[PDB]
Design a protein around this ligand. Structure first.
Ligand code: 1OH
Ligand code: 1OH
Lengths: 227, 227
């Protein structure tokens, strides 16, 4: 009862920060902004795949089921990261330490509506005082609960959901006795995460189809996955 | 402890069944199918607005906040209804007793992908053995948790969420002692409901823009709401 092992484990499994490194030789444009974001996402995806192996039971799934979960959840994981990094900021999104977007920049990149939705997620989590413990557990839950149409072992995936849900419940029962409904409140933030992710995916799929922004192999693979 | 009053209340507040009444004089087409569905939805929307007043604290919200919740949640409520009606069927959606769509009909109407997503929701709820008690409580939660950008009294809306979340938790603690994580499992079905609803809204917005399917006042009002 010092607190949940799965939560502790997810905390130590947390990947190091990644830099966006916008090209200082390129003039600022919508194409620059979007090229930078997609490049950053491609590198994050590598780290996410590595991170997932630390989740209890994930590496025991078939490679196919592992990839199905990742192909469904990837954008929710990416978004939750930016959301968390942005918690101590106001009306700004911390994509990286060297890449913090305010309203004007979002307009320039054509991302005003998308970044406003992400800011809505930030707003909700701020008022809830989302902790790192909660963030890492929610990223794991979003992976397990990602609703892929293509799952082979449905029951094993449901088991993984249950293991991580239990970790959230246990953590909340021990750490937040003042609110016995905090775990459920955390789970009730997942629909807006799903909604914002669905919008981000279609948006960047549209950018992919327009052909003006170069994208790397892994990002494209994730983007080109079937719903 | 016979069981939760809010749940009992929602049960008696449950609206009577509505008929689709496809026009028997009109030849079957995609336009007929979609005209019928949108007409049915328009009449359901009237009943949903009436139903919401029975939810504790809802009518105490300002008219603006009431309408914001409804304009964000309406499609999730409509979808959850079809999902529930379809639970004892296989690969068919019971839009109404006189309007049950199989795969072929969905293809004809251009709804294959949408109806497959709704069937995924059905599949999950079947395996969970979703009860009417749970269905009615989830419709209410989806309304309160609908994530409108336009809320005036955020704290009152959060209170409504909490009241209905508490009802779900209490019901599950009393009725399903074999699974102390069933309430959370119910909440973890809301992201796919949100996802499917977002897709249904854009789809029918596209149909609205094409101008070939006539739609009524209230349905259009709900469709024309800002995200
Ligand atoms: C490019 C992408 C997918 C993005 C950018 C803007 C809005 C939504 C997603 C992104 C990139 C990096 C990241 O950490 C999170 C998301
Ligand atoms: C027309 C609409 C919004 C619909 C139809 C097909 C797929 C998704 C939504 C609908 C209509 C009636 C209904 O009970 C639930 C949904």
């Amino acid at each position: 009862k010092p607190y949940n092992k799965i939560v502790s484990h997810l905390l130590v499994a947390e990947p190091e920060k990644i830099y966006a490194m916008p090209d200082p030789t390129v003039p600022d444009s919508d194409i620059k902004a979007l090229t930078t974001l997609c490049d950053l996402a491609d590198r994050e995806l590598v780290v996410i795949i590595g991170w997932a192996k630390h989740i209890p039971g994930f590496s025991t799934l078939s490679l196919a089921d592992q990839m199905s979960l990742l192909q469904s959840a990837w954008m929710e994981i990416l978004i939750l990261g930016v959301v968390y990094r942005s918690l101590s900021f106001e009306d700004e999104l911390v994509y990286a330490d060297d890449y913090i977007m305010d309203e004007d920049q979002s307009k320039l990149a054509g991302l005003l509506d998308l970044n406003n939705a992400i800011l809505q997620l930030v707003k909700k989590y701020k008022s809830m005082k989302l902790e790192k413990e909660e963030f890492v557990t929610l990223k794991a839950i979003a992976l397990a609960n990602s609703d892929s149409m293509h799952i082979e072992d449905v029951e094993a995936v449901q088991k993984l959901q249950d293991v991580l849900h239990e970790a959230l419940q246990d953590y909340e029962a021990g750490q937040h006795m003042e609110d016995p409904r905090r775990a459920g409140k955390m789970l009730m933030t997942l629909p807006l995460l799903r909604q914002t992710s669905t919008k981000a995916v279609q948006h960047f799929y549209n950018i992919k189809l327009e052909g003006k922004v170069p994208m790397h192999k892994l990002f494209l693979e994730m983007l080109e996955a079937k719903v």
